[PDB]
Write a protein that binds this ligand. Structure first.
Ligand SMILES: Nc1ncnc2c1ncn2[C@@H]1O[C@H](COP(=O)(O)OP(=O)(O)OP(O)(O)=S)[C@@H](O)[C@H]1O
Length: 288
């Protein structure tokens, strides 16, 4: 059942919110790929059609140019009718870290560290690239365990909320104005992102550092460090992330105090006290 004159569709892999993902065989390259067929809507008409389209096309143009083994590769885009289009991706086996933590609750430190070093290498690449990127949505749902194991390989994905640190937007003194305040998953976002006032927050790649701290903590203890049993609307109501001034560690399971010291470096409340991605990428804890 072939698409774009190459793209022979084999079977379903999964469903997104408004998409279906098929395993396909790329007849020209002669490799297996994932075709994600985006299907909207017939009754959103006009306004919500085009800003869903440009959100998708924006993500596509960021993600297309990324070439690194710890980031899922994006091969192609093409439209079908007016109300649907496809993106074509590197075919990845296994499930994601969110699913893994549902089955197995937590993991070992050696395993949790194995994942974090890999994530950090992706972040180092995103901060070496042609205008640097903040991957604003780092979370277990966007970390694929491609070998089906925690000790094995991982890759990151989903640049829908990702901010571009170009010269118009960003400088190293101030950082960049937060574009779309309220977006993203609040457990993995830092305190500065929740301040509401006259002017929007100023952010940098230090929001990804906070995410890494939270994700690592979650892998070790099987619980999130802030707002564990709280919805998104609860987090905002209670300002639980603005109160996240000191991170506590349950006595079980045992983690090294070097691991705990690493988490405190990543989860520094005040962004000026927090290490940036460059400094995270040469953190002593992560040295082989
Ligand atoms: N590169 C890939 N390789 C294999 N399977 C994939 C790949 N990308 C997506 N899938 C499958 O598609 C399912 C959901 O697609 P995702 O795009 O990850 O979800 P989503 O972000 O909610 O989708 P939206 O809402 O349309 S952006 C996953 O559970 C996978 O099984």
């Amino acid at each position: 059942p072939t698409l774009n004159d190459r793209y022979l569709l084999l079977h379903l892999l999964g469903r997104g919110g408004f998409s279906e993902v098929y395993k396909a065989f790329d007849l020209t390259e002669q490799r297996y790929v994932a075709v994600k067929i985006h299907q909207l809507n017939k009754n959103w008409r006009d306004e919500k059609k085009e800003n869903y389209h440009k959100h998708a096309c924006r993500e596509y143009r960021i993600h297309k140019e990324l070439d690194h083994p710890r980031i899922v590769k994006l091969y192609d885009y093409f439209s079908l009718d007016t109300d649907s289009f496809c993106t074509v991706l590197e075919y990845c086996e296994g499930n994601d870290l969110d699913f893994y933590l549902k089955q197995h609750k937590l993991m070992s430190e050696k395993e949790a560290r194995s994942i974090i070093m890999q994530i950090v290498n992706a972040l180092k690449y995103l901060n070496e690239i042609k205008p640097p990127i903040i991957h604003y949505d780092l979370k277990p749902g966007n970390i694929l365990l491609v070998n089906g194991t925690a000790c094995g390989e991982i890759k990151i994905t989903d640049f829908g909320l990702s901010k571009i640190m170009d010269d118009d937007s960003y400088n190293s003194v101030d950082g960049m104005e937060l574009t779309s305040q309220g977006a993203g998953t609040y457990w993995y976002l830092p305190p500065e992102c929740f301040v509401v006032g006259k002017e929007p927050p100023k952010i940098s790649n230090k929001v990804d550092v906070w995410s890494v701290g939270v994700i690592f903590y979650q892998c070790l203890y099987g619980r999130k460090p802030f707002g564990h049993n709280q919805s998104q609307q609860d987090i905002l109501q209670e300002n639980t992330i603005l109160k996240a001034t000191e991170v506590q560690f349950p006595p079980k399971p045992v983690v090294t105090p070097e691991a705990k010291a690493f988490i405190r470096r990543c989860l520094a409340y005040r962004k000026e006290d927090r290490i940036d991605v460059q400094q995270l990428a040469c953190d002593p804890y992560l040295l082989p």
